Amino acid sequence: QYSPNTQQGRTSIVHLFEWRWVDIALECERYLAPKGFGGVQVSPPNENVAIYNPFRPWWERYQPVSYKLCTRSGNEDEFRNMVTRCNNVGVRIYVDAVINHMCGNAVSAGTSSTCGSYFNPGSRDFPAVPYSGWDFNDGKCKTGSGDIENYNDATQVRDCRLTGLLDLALEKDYVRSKIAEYMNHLIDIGVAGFRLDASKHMWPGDIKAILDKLHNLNSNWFPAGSKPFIYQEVIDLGGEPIKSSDYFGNGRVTEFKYGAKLGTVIRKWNGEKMSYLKNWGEGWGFVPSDRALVFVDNHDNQRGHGAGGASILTFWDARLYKMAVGFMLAHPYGFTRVMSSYRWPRQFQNGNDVNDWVGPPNNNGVIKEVTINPDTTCGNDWVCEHRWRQIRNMVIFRNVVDGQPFTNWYDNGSNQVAFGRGNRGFIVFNNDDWSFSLTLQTGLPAGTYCDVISGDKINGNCTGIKIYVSDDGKAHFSISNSAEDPFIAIHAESKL
Ligand SMILES: C[C@H]1O[C@H](O)[C@H](O)[C@@H](O)[C@@H]1N[C@H]1C=C(CO)[C@@H](O[C@H]2O[C@H](CO)[C@@H](O[C@H]3O[C@H](CO)[C@@H](O[C@H]4O[C@H](CO)[C@@H](O)[C@H](O)[C@H]4O)[C@H](O)[C@H]3O)[C@H](O)[C@H]2O)[C@H](O)[C@H]1O
Ligand SMILES: *[C@H]1O[C@H](CO)[C@@H](O)[C@H](O)[C@H]1NC(C)=O
Ligand SMILES: O=N[O-]
Ligand SMILES: [Ca+2]
Structure with missing residues (x-):
């Protein structure tokens, strides 16, 4: 469950947050496959509650009604068509599995669901599954509100309602079977793995029992004996009873300390600076690299809806975001997920974004198609960070240097740092308020390399900055603290 099951080479997955299945299918064929992406995190594919107050917020998809693959992203056939087309071009699909709970206990009963299934939170009836009052933790939860009240009590965190979401009795074989039935349907369809939503709120052992019910990946696309990739969403920072290491027996875990600390370092908060990143990784109290799913931001915290808080960098801070994603994609630690x-x-008042609920671009509630502009950027309000040159090229950078060790580190004791990956790649950063001009050991073979941040290698020539590596591997780099992108990256495949 620790291997992402990507084609040989592919080292990253991209979260196409709220995209429709038909759009992801096309993206697999037109961009993801040729650019070297490993897979796609899709939003929950199961039927959810249609919430109109506020209007169709993104979080309504973490409020399950049934396991029918029927949502604003598409129906069961569109989903299947997506997995098939993506697998055929070597791009995997990872499902965001919302299995800890059903919808909020106070949501009104009826057919206000993405597939019209009837459900009654109050009577705890979800006939489309079916689930009844016997399948929830009402009796088990010991808090006065029935909701989670204190995170210092690990039991309550697992047995009570996360912000009121009806909590499934995951110790019951009936519930484990219903969930495995849903997950096996997706696996047999071609899905390569899962994001286990709210894993902190599930007992490591209940997750284990459910995983024991899962099949091996579809043998038409995957090697025999392939176990689905599993990454547990567990927000574990400082002091609290639950540790993400408690889930290592089930697969990887989201390392929320990663984006949080990379954000404070890049923002230079509390005296932090890039020179400190020399021991980036476990040295920072992070989980072991082979158990980490890393990212700069995720759908929640990019809205201030999660771990990391204010330090989290997003597409809104484009300049620094590209830098952060660049360091992440160049560093060997963990398995990288691009947002x-x-x-x-986004509109702030008294410090909070009152529009952080807003769902994806839509027309009367219908999610808008992702349109591709002539310059390869997206329209219809989709940001498509994965299409940004500086990010897509670092995605390729990660593939090129895969397996190569972290080496040749340099820092000026402040914010000008650089490092290489074996003799396959080199990256340099300048986040100080002054220019950086110096000759560094790159560990790369002599020659002329195209800097993939400022440009691309095309038709045997460079469109941007060019770096010359001498016979001893040394090369001169010059970065103005005013540069559009204050960092340079060169690798074996951008060599002329
Ligand atoms: C949110 C995080 O809280 C901790 O930190 C956990 O450790 C961590 O695991 C979790 N993050 C994961 C899990 C959930 C929960 O479903 C998702 O939260 C996402 O989905 C939730 C459910 O829709 C959202 O809740 C929001 O919506 C719910 C209903 O739609 C509301 O229920 C409330 O109103 C409903 C009616 O309107 C009632 O029926 C319900 O009983 C009542 O509790 C919550 O009060 C509200 O905050 C949440 O705002 C969003 O971020 C995240 O995307 C996912 O990353
Ligand atoms: C790269 O571009 C230059 C012109 O900018 C041209 O002279 C050169 O021959 C090109 N290289 C190749 C390999 O086509
Ligand atoms: O999986 N990211 O929360
Ligand atoms: Ca639970």
């Missing part, structure tokens, strides 16, 4: 979002009417 891809949509622009929303």
Whole structure:
């Protein structure tokens, strides 16, 4: 469950947050496959509650009604068509599995669901599954509100309602079977793995029992014996009873300390600076690299809806974001997930964004198609960070240097740092308020390399900055603290 099951080479997955299945299918064929992306995190594919107050917020998809593959992203056939077309071009699909709970206990009963299934939170009836009052933790939860009240009590965190979401009795074989039935349907369809939503709220052992029910990946696309990739969403920072290491027996875990600390370092908060990143990784209290799913921001915290808080960097801080994603894609630590979002009417007051609920670009509730502009950027308000040159090229950079060790580190004791990956790649950063001009050991073979941040290698020539590596591997780099992108990256495949 620790291997992402990507084709040989592919080292990253992209979160196409709220994209429709038909759009992801096309993206697999037109961009993801040729650019070297490993897979796609799709939003929950199961039927959810249609919430109109506020109007169709993104979070309504973490409020399950049934396991029918029927949502604003598409129906069961469109989903299947997506997995098939993506697998055929070597791009995997990872499902965001919302299995800890059903919808909010106070949501009104009826057919206000993405597939019209009837459900009654109050009587705890979800006939489309079916689930009844016997399948929820009402009796088990010991808090006065029935909701989670204190995170210092690991039991309550697992047995009570996360912000009121009806909590499934995951210890019951009936519930484990219903969930495995849903996950096996997706696996047999071609899905390569899952994001286990709210894993902190599930007992490591209940997750284990459910995983024991899962099949091996579809043998038409995957090697025999392939176990689905599993990454547990567990927000574990400082002091609290639950540790993400408690889930290592089930697969990887989201390392929320990663984006949080990379954000404070890049923002230079509390005296932090890039020179400190020399021991980036476990040295920072992070989980072991082979158990980490890393990212700069995720759909939640990019809205201030999660771990990391204010330090989290997003597409809104484009300049620094590209830098952060660049360091992440160049560093060997963990398995990288690139965020891809949509622009929303972010409006702050008294410090909080009152529009952080806004769902994806839509027309009367119907999610808008992703349109590709002539310059390869997206329209319809989709940000498509994965299409940004500096990010897509670092995605390729990661593939090129895969397996190569972290080496040849340099820092000026402040914010000008650089490092290489074996003799396959080299990257340099300048985040100080002054220019950086110096000759560094790159560990790369002599020659002329195209800097993939400022440009591309095309038709045997460079469109941007060019770096010359001498016979001893040394090369001169010059970065103005005013440069559009204050960092340079060169690798074996951008060599002329
Ligand atoms: C949110 C995080 O809280 C901790 O930090 C956990 O440790 C962590 O695991 C979790 N993050 C994961 C899990 C959930 C939960 O479903 C998702 O939260 C996402 O989906 C939730 C459910 O729709 C959202 O809740 C929001 O919507 C719910 C209903 O739609 C509301 O229920 C409330 O109103 C409903 C009616 O309107 C009622 O029926 C319900 O009983 C009542 O509790 C919550 O009060 C509200 O905050 C949440 O705002 C969003 O971020 C995240 O995307 C996912 O990353
Ligand atoms: C790269 O471009 C230059 C012109 O900018 C041209 O002279 C050169 O021959 C090109 N290289 C190749 C390999 O086509
Ligand atoms: O999986 N990211 O929360
Ligand atoms: Ca639970």
